[PDB]
């Protein structure tokens, strides 16, 4: 769940990759199913939306039993897991996943060639902003990171809802394409980490579950301020929490070699400089030709 100990239970079940993938909350029927689940579990709706700290302590104590009793029915039996929790005296607890999410949020949204340099240097500064937060004397940075993580998750959820509702994910025998060209949150999708967050969100929902074949997904986002696409080549994933022989074998990501070959053949000023080869930057006028070349490559 997403920031269970720093938000409301309803929000924890709402802004979650696995929960949404299992229940497909992006449509109204998913929200109705979630409401029915909460009603069956016995937790009221007003109580479920109260912050974790101020929520009634009885339900907080009995939560594990409630989850065990009433989650098999809705298929969310893989939600339960064992994780590390670190708490300092008289201060609220925090789990490893929440700490990592806060650190990533601080890295992402915390705070011609000139714009590129400014963006990269802002990311470098955010690196140090995150570095300090990793200490026990800088709890304020941790709280700010948690708030920023909440905001980023809300924005990514909204964008994913829009994409899924409008059915922008075209399907091809080899790969799947999702190109963004408008929206209110397109500014955020310039940091590779945020774009990868959106990619993971989309991969979990209907690309790894819902009886769908596993194909690499190419996700791109425009930025009119520089006229280029932050194309990212993501790898598929097997259903979460399903141990099997095929699950043991890692799913290799073949985007790097095909990307390099296509860049070598053509000339579109592709910026292959990120350490992760999955991400490049292609000019606006040369996106569709590059996609056609990738389709013809047959190397994915």
């Amino acid at each position: 769940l997403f920031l269970l100990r720093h938000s409301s239970l309803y929000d924890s079940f709402y802004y979650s990759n696995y929960v949404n993938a299992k229940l497909s909350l992006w449509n109204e029927n998913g929200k109705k199913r979630l409401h029915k689940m909460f009603a069956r579990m016995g937790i009221p709706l007003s109580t479920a939306q109260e912050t974790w700290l101020y929520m009634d302590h009885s339900i907080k104590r009995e939560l594990g039993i409630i989850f065990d009793k009433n989650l098999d029915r809705y298929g969310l039996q893989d939600i339960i897991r064992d994780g590390f929790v670190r708490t300092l005296g008289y201060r609220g607890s925090i789990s490893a996943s929440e700490f990592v999410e806060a650190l990533t949020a601080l890295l992402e949204v915390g705070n011609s060639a000139q714009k590129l340099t400014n963006l990269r240097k802002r990311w470098v500064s955010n690196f140090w902003l995150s570095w300090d937060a990793l200490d026990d004397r800088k709890v304020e940075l941790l709280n700010r990171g948690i708030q920023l993580a909440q905001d980023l998750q809300r924005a990514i959820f909204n964008t994913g809802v829009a994409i899924l509702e409008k059915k922008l994910i075209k399907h091809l025998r080899i790969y799947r394409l999702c190109v963004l060209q408008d929206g209110p949150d397109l500014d955020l999708y310039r940091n590779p980490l945020t774009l990868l967050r959106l990619g993971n969100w989309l991969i979990e929902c209907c690309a790894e579950s819902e009886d769908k074949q596993l194909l690499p997904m190419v996700l791109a986002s425009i930025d009119e301020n520089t006229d280029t696409y932050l194309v990212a080549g993501l790898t598929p994933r097997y259903p979460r929490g399903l141990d099997t022989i095929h699950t043991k074998k890692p799913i290799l990501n073949n985007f790097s070699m095909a990307f390099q070959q296509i860049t070598a053949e053509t000339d579109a000023k592709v910026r292959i400089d990120n350490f992760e080869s999955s991400i490049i930057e292609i000019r606006r006028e040369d996106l569709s030709p590059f996609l056609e070349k990738l389709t013809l490559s047959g190397l994915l």
Binding site: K121, V124, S125, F127, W128, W131, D132
Partner: protein
Amino acid sequence: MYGDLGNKLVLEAKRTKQLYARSNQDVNLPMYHEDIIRNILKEVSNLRKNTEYLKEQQQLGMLDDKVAKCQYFVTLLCMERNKRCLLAYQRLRTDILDSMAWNNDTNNLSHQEQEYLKEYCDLITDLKSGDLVDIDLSGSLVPPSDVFIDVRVLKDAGEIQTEYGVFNLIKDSQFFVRQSDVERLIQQGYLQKI
């Protein structure tokens, strides 16, 4: 009467002192108040003219001893008050200038004050070059502490070659160095103790 301009100048000096006290190093002296000083000096010249007239009248004319004494004493007292006010203003400005010189635009300084600043910097260089050469007099009065600290650069710069070594001050790059080596760089504002 005669001390109004002096009192106004003293009020301005008080305001300057309060401003200097409020901040630490951003303090910049206000524009050297020249008009009021010139008015006060015109007042002093007028008082000198009156004194000369009184002397002439006493030597040539009718002027009883008591009246002459009263007038002379009053004039002398006004001149003394003006002298005190101007001297206090100048002394305060000199104190601020000395503070600035020891710690380390000029349009706010009278040419005499600019010469004063130059000479005082020369003097500071003079004392430090004598027998007190082992101790850097123009140092930091914060007592020593943990020998090794982490300093983060706050301003992009080149491979500045200081006496202690070559530090590539790439913006947003942390160092782990002895506090002594990066004391002056911290003072100049390139680094941050965090």
